[PDB]
């Protein structure tokens, strides 16, 4: 059996808090701030993911190129293995060839 | 795991309902009844 007999606790979801009320704000700062800043420097996150999108290959190559020297041993090792596998996969495997 | 089915019980038990009156282990088990209910239909 996988189903549960009794119900779970009811979720409290405060739809009016700091982030949910201030959400999306200062996203047009570039458009109506005399273009002093672009919204892409607004997002807080990794250094290689800032106003940039890409698939697995692009993301891993960008990671190792940008912050690769700061990587741990096992992490860089499995990252290189991943990009090697993905190279040969994306280039050799699938339909449309 | 991020997406998992919770209503499998019901989706199988409607078939088990159609298969209650059968004889043997078909009425009880599922994969044995699936091969039979479509046949009955």
């Amino acid at each position: 059996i996988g189903i549960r007999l009794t119900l779970p606790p009811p979720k409290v979801v405060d739809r009016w808090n700091e982030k949910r009320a201030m959400f999306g704000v200062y996203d047009n700062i570039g458009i109506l701030g005399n273009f002093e800043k672009h919204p892409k420097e607004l997002i807080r996150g990794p250094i290689w993911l800032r106003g940039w999108k890409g698939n697995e290959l692009q993301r891993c190559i960008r990671k190792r190129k940008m912050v690769g020297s700061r990587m741990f041993a096992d992490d860089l090792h499995n990252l290189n293995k991943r990009i090697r596998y993905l190279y040969k996969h994306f280039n050799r495997h699938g339909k449309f060839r | 795991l991020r997406n998992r089915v919770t209503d499998r019980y019901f989706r199988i038990q409607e078939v088990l309902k159609h298969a209650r009156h059968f004889r043997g282990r078909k009425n009880r088990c599922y994969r044995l009844a699936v091969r039979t209910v479509i046949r009955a239909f």
């Binding site: 189903i3 009794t6 779970p8 | 919770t6 209503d7």
Partner: peptide, 26 residues
């Protein structure tokens, strides 16, 4: 444990139905 409670609600309904069939009130 599996997340979600819609199925748990449906199953509570089925359980109470079965309970009524087992010991239905007058």
């Amino acid at each position: 444990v599996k997340k979600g409670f819609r199925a748990a609600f449906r199953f509570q309904k089925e359980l109470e139905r079965q309970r009524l069939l087992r010991c239905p009130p007058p």
